[PDB]
Amino acid sequence: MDCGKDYCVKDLSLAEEGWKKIDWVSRFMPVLQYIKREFEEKKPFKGVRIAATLHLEMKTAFLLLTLKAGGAEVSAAASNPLSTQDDVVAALAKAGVKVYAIRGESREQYYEFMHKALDIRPNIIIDDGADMISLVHKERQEMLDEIWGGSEETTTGVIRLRAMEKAGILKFPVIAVNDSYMKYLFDNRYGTGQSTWDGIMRATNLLIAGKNVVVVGYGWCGRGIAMRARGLGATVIVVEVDPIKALEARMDGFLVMDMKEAAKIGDIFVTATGNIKCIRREHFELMKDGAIMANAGHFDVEIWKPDLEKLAVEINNPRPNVTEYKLKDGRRLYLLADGRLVNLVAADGHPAEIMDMSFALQAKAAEYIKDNHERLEPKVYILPREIDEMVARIKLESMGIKIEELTEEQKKYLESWEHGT
Amino acid sequence: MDCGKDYCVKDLSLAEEGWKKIDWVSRFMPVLQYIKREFEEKKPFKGVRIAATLHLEMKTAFLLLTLKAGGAEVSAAASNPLSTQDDVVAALAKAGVKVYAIRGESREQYYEFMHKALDIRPNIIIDDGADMISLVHKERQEMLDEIWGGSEETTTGVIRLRAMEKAGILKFPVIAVNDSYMKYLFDNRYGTGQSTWDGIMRATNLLIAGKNVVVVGYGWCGRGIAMRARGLGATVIVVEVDPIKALEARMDGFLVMDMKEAAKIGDIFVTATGNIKCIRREHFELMKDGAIMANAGHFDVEIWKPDLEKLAVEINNPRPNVTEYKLKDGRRLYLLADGRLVNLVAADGHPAEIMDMSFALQAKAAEYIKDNHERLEPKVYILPREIDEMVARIKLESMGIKIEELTEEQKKYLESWEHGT
Amino acid sequence: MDCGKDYCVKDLSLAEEGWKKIDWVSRFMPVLQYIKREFEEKKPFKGVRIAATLHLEMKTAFLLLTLKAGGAEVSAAASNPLSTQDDVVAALAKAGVKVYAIRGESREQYYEFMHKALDIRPNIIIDDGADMISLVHKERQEMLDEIWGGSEETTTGVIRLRAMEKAGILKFPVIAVNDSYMKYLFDNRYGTGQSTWDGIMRATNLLIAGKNVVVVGYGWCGRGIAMRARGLGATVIVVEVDPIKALEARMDGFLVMDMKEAAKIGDIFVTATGNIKCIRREHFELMKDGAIMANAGHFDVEIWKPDLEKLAVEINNPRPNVTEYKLKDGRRLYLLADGRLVNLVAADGHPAEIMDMSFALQAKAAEYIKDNHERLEPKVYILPREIDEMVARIKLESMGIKIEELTEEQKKYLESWEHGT
Amino acid sequence: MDCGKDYCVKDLSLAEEGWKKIDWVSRFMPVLQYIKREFEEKKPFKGVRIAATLHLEMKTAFLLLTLKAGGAEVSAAASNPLSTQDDVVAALAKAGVKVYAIRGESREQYYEFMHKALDIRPNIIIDDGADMISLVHKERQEMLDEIWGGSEETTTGVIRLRAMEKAGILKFPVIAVNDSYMKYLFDNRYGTGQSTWDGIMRATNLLIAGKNVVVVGYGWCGRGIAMRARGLGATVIVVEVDPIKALEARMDGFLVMDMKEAAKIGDIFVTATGNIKCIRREHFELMKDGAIMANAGHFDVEIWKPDLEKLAVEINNPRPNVTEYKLKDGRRLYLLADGRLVNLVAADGHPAEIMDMSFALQAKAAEYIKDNHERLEPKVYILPREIDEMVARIKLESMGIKIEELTEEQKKYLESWEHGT
């Protein structure tokens, strides 16, 4: 509605509430605040244009404003059509960020807006899911040589970009921010663990304790989702295709079965595979009446909605972010958040302190691209662990935690080999 | 605004959304559904008038509709001015329940509406905090003849009523529903454990893991809040006045210290004491910058607001359900939900399956009073344990769980003494 | 072998090692040490004779020596033929305690020794399982009028004594020490939780994580056994006959099924029912090859050994405290500790700090019997909660823990009823 | 005492008990049983000579017998002077393994026996701490021609060997078995987590719940020790030098502080660093009376014994595997197992099912060296991940667990980039 050359938002009059959300979470983001103070002093992004595809809530907004405080000209598009928070996006538009996003936008608008964000002709692309980096290579090839590099937030995006590199069509360097220690060990595990159940509880008002919770995938996200589900009193069943991770889940005290056996007994199903069709026709047919299904992975393809639609004689919407599929025999199965990221659609995403660290790495990755892209090949890179170390020490210090320091004798001992029994 | 003899609600046009909310949670309340079918078949409350003071959200609405389906004429008032959900109440007014409640009620409206609810001339009073039963004894003594009895939902109300009995001011029988095994072992512990953190995450979007969570009170609510806080990754510090429960918290793996020591290190404070001034002036003075405070117990007197106001040079409202008290030294302390029941004010209360068992007991208590008021004395009773077992057996059956049966030989062994060795 | 009028022990030359065990655990028993200092000063048991039936390890020995330091003449017999520690018992004999116990003694010696302990003509009987109190009523009735009272340590004994009271044959007062808050909330739960797995690991050297652990009974012992099993990485399945406790186990995150379904899937079975024949023929027939079975309840009747013997074509003993039952189809099932208390036969029983509190109550119960038995009927009593409070405050102080104290305003508030919304 | 050219053991007559111990744990080692049948059928080590330095208990004996069943001639020496179990070693001598070990070995005997084990002129060396591989490089350089390669079991040894490679002193290939997923994710974490507390309870009979447990090091062992300590009811304090791992411990719910601060409040201290002097003079000076200290890492240098001896006015031995250092102010600090591997010295090491997977990898590593030594360089290698997957699949199958299979469509999706949205 409020839609022009510089932005396309639902309603600019929502900006005051968006500003309050941005100010609130920024009070609990000490690492990005530390970085923002440096950016304001040195203005390292003066004259630099940045286009970002991220989940457009208040922590994302604070990162974009941090990049702007460093001198950058920033455009932004949504990483998911349903995760955008309209009031936050109005505040971004008021701040001069060229943001193009409306909550609930269509898939075609999702890409029409992504193109508009790309119109800034970015030097740096910040991506979440690799849609924007892929879109440039497919439909905006005229702009490739102007792009220094990109940084990718999530596992699904890194998988896509590595396949792009394998096929020889990646045309600029990419930082796999997801692969940094202070990202996947914290965001993917602890962040997703809390916010997935935050969203499921918010959407349903249902009890987690005494439920059979089925977690499909025992990677970093599945681990955290299973961890916190157990912490909320649930009986957790893990479904995995990796035999090593399946044994880990056993040692962690969780049941391990395949997806058909899990489908018969699960009360709540959560997918975190980054894969396609992990739950489909024959699993829905086995599910108990009232089964809750949620996706915490990527896009909307982990739980195969077309199979649910073919089984349903009625499709209803009893609550916001709850789609009811009524089957022939009268069973009703419930899909949360239209099969999209339940933590970001049914809730407010990861907590502020988690995205502080993930978006601190993103800020450092943008600086790394700015300053090293000419020595980098069109390949996927991981940030040096020194940046991980810096983010961790800033967080610990803001926490008031002082850790042991190695003595010179101990450093010597760890490099030696003669001191045995 | 939509106010009359039979109801007083904010907006009747919100009823359609309220109905969707009631329909939803009712799908996950099997025990109360079992009872509603019995009530609908037999109509045990035909001609009976029931006045209820409860937290007016969707699970409460299904309890009130279940009583109406049993033939009762039902009036309803809010148990807390900020827990009422206006769309649910609109649906109750449309359903013929004489409900008088608006979210954000003044204290004067709170008691005016409770008086309007009493105008039904009830035979049975269902109470939640003992305000209504106290109000009849103070201001509506002409109602005492017609009143068969009352039922009290919560710990705080039962304490008040037992005190009224001790002083000899109680005039009609009272069922202490809170004292049923199927209530305080589940509602108070598991329900409050989940819904307290549901509300805290919803209000703040902050990380629970790696925080110092201080839980004041290690009763049934405190146990649950502490258990789920640990499940979400927090370090938990328990503050108690009972030495036995303090040792229980230690053995459960939690730190135990006094309120002053806890105030210095806590990041999030949760009170669940049912007592007054468990966090007060001297504790606020010790708290770290950015401390989060929330009350999970009765009323709003556990965290003493007047002390916060006197310390504050500025009182701000950065988020819905977050009050910011800025102190002279620049520190900011955040009180959630105005110091009232954080699960019911900042979220949707206990999950549906928990309220199913609690309100099943309430429905049984109302039927118990109906069937026994001529045999009861003006004192506090607890439901026979056979009702607890019925509720637990209906729930287990609806879960598809069948448990081991105690054999006749085993029963006789348990009543013998000669078989030792 | 070293067997006379004053004692019957395996070998007095083992006393030096027994003294060291007694000294060791006594360093970590601050509550009983506190009581012992009082006893040494006041000598309240001067001229009093005490006969005890307890598990004769080093914590029991310290209680008996504490009673002796108070002036008592003490005799002792084993509460279980397999839990006696011969070196501890030699030290007791060297100390002047009239102890009659040899590890591995027969059932007939178990009672022959119990009679010898009774020959002291006790004023006070301290019992664990009610064998001695029952033996007096059956076979030593000539001595009843000389006995002031008894105290019973465990749930199984209290069950027997209450049945004795019901039948009208209990002839002196009995203190149900097991029923004290500081007993069953700590000994039965936390003590049994740790020491059961202490014994199972010691006997087997097998992994607990990633195992299906079946806990039969979800009372105080079963809760703790399930708690700690989960803490060691196991998948815990709870078998219960109480529907309320079955739901508790669900809410605590454990599977709940009946014993036939549990038998098919369990890797380790632990009984804590205090009942007879909870695991029998048809369950053994369903068990997987290599199933481990252990009893943590009472006697050796919870797992029905006669059924295992009838199924076995070979009975072997591959490890100390491991009996192998080789079945017709080649399956091998393993019973720990001959079906007796696995924590006390395969290990060293509860940890010292736990039995500090249980045996502190026992010392206070003996004092309570001494001083109140003439005002007591031949019935089962529970100690006043003031003693529970005293034990808890001594433990907290020895721990360096200072708890909140109620203000006079708060005490007033909890007795009031007028202060509502 | 029973010493000769082919073996040196304490007492050959202990062999019968050693065999029972080997037979027992072998029943619960399915993966190594699977490999032993393959080895027995194919005899891949016919004519091969293998010298091993391992902790000589029953699971090690089954590994050595499995290699012998494959046709290998096997010599064995102790990996630690106090972890050897004399009856197991007696059985190995009876079985034809050239084992030279006695529990309680002097340091001189330790290296004399390791030299006797090397007299076999091995083709493959299996090492556990890199003492033997270091000893060949220092004192048996004439052996270097015939040596195909070595395999290192543990973190400390791999560090030594990688340092030897860096300095260019390594002369033959080395397999870093510790670096296999199926090893360090399970042995180091879950195995050490259980067996450390197994040993601590066995030595002390003290309560774990409600204690302040300080874990020094949050690597794989530290993670496991902390996780199981929390599972047993303790409050866990983590001391780290890695800032990333320190934040992991916080998010896992543990307190994080430096060694001096932890020394003031810890009740039980466990070191798992693989480093020297992580607890030393200044820390002992701060410790509470009665502090328990134990080492779960390499050698006995993590807790610096010489500092304890200098502080002590008295050194006593109140229990087996408990050394008491009485300080000038009367405080008593207790070091378990002489500061050596507490799980292996005060207990029976890792449980059998854990060592099954670790020693399956060792058997595969020995076969790998046999099959690849002519293609390898004098540097440190890690086994191909296909062997990890084989071990995990054999274990899952023996558990009756069948996991979901990755479909061809899903594999192709994971190698694509065009499918976004």
Ligand SMILES: NC(=O)c1ccc[n+]([C@@H]2O[C@H](COP(=O)([O-])OP(=O)(O)OC[C@H]3O[C@@H](n4cnc5c(N)ncnc54)[C@H](O)[C@@H]3O)[C@@H](O)[C@H]2O)c1
């Ligand atoms: N806020 C969020 O919701 C959030 C945060 C981080 C990452 N993610 C997304 O979550 C997904 C995974 O995150 P990760 O970092 O855990 O990936 P990961 O690869 O660590 O874990 C993936 C696991 O999925 C398992 N898997 C794949 N197909 C499967 C199937 N059909 N059935 C069962 N298990 C299967 C794999 O074996 C692997 O262990 C990605 O899509 C990532 O983008 C979401």
Ligand SMILES: NC(=O)c1ccc[n+]([C@@H]2O[C@H](COP(=O)([O-])OP(=O)(O)OC[C@H]3O[C@@H](n4cnc5c(N)ncnc54)[C@H](O)[C@@H]3O)[C@@H](O)[C@H]2O)c1
């Ligand atoms: N939905 C909800 O939020 C919900 C649900 C159930 C109960 N409640 C309310 O929660 C409160 C307690 O519920 P309960 O069932 O736990 O009561 P409970 O009495 O079991 O626990 C109360 C604990 O508070 C401790 N306590 C009292 N004053 C204290 C102080 N000054 N400092 C520290 N500890 C103190 C007492 O020792 C007691 O153990 C009541 O007000 C009850 O109505 C709220």
Ligand SMILES: NC(=O)c1ccc[n+]([C@@H]2O[C@H](COP(=O)([O-])OP(=O)(O)OC[C@H]3O[C@@H](n4cnc5c(N)ncnc54)[C@H](O)[C@@H]3O)[C@@H](O)[C@H]2O)c1
């Ligand atoms: N050191 C120890 O091993 C130790 C310590 C304390 C008590 N105990 C013994 O443990 C036993 C129980 O201790 P408690 O204090 O837990 O008793 P408790 O009564 O609290 O729990 C007993 C549970 O067993 C359940 N039960 C009974 N028969 C059953 C069956 N056939 N199948 C399944 N569940 C069944 C009951 O429902 C009850 O919940 C008693 O024999 C007591 O003496 C042993």
Ligand SMILES: NC(=O)c1ccc[n+]([C@@H]2O[C@H](COP(=O)([O-])OP(=O)(O)OC[C@H]3O[C@@H](n4cnc5c(N)ncnc54)[C@H](O)[C@@H]3O)[C@@H](O)[C@H]2O)c1
């Ligand atoms: N059966 C056993 O007891 C067993 C089993 C496996 C490994 N280990 C031994 O345990 C040790 C570690 O095993 P790992 O696999 O955990 O190593 P790891 O390196 O994963 O963990 C080591 C941790 O120690 C930390 N550290 C180093 N010096 C420190 C100090 N001074 N203070 C605090 N933290 C410090 C490092 O930061 C690192 O995180 C090695 O010696 C290994 O051989 C023992």
Ligand SMILES: N[C@@H](CCSC[C@H]1O[C@@H](n2cnc3c(=O)[nH]cnc32)[C@H](O)[C@@H]1O)C(=O)O
């Ligand atoms: N954009 C795609 C891919 C999944 S996004 C997953 C990413 O979201 C990120 N994330 C989680 N919570 C938040 C938040 O509150 N703000 C911004 N990003 C978030 C997190 O870093 C993770 O890598 C989609 O919606 O399906």
Ligand SMILES: N[C@@H](CCSC[C@H]1O[C@@H](n2cnc3c(=O)[nH]cnc32)[C@H](O)[C@@H]1O)C(=O)O
């Ligand atoms: N008088 C005080 C305290 C009583 S409320 C505490 C009660 O609220 C109940 N409760 C918790 N969640 C819900 C809900 O969603 N609907 C209705 N009652 C609830 C719970 O049973 C508990 O006993 C006040 O009203 O604010």
Ligand SMILES: N[C@@H](CCSC[C@H]1O[C@@H](n2cnc3c(=O)[nH]cnc32)[C@H](O)[C@@H]1O)C(=O)O
């Ligand atoms: N004597 C019977 C009944 C069970 S005894 C169970 C009791 O043992 C007690 N107990 C547990 N550990 C110890 C210990 O180390 N010493 C003495 N008593 C113990 C505990 O208090 C519990 O009530 C039998 O052996 O079957």
Ligand SMILES: N[C@@H](CCSC[C@H]1O[C@@H](n2cnc3c(=O)[nH]cnc32)[C@H](O)[C@@H]1O)C(=O)O
């Ligand atoms: N060189 C040092 C540290 C190496 S031992 C650490 C290794 O012991 C192994 N281990 C643990 N329990 C057992 C057991 O019962 N038998 C054999 N090895 C074991 C485990 O795999 C780990 O990598 C020393 O020998 O004392």
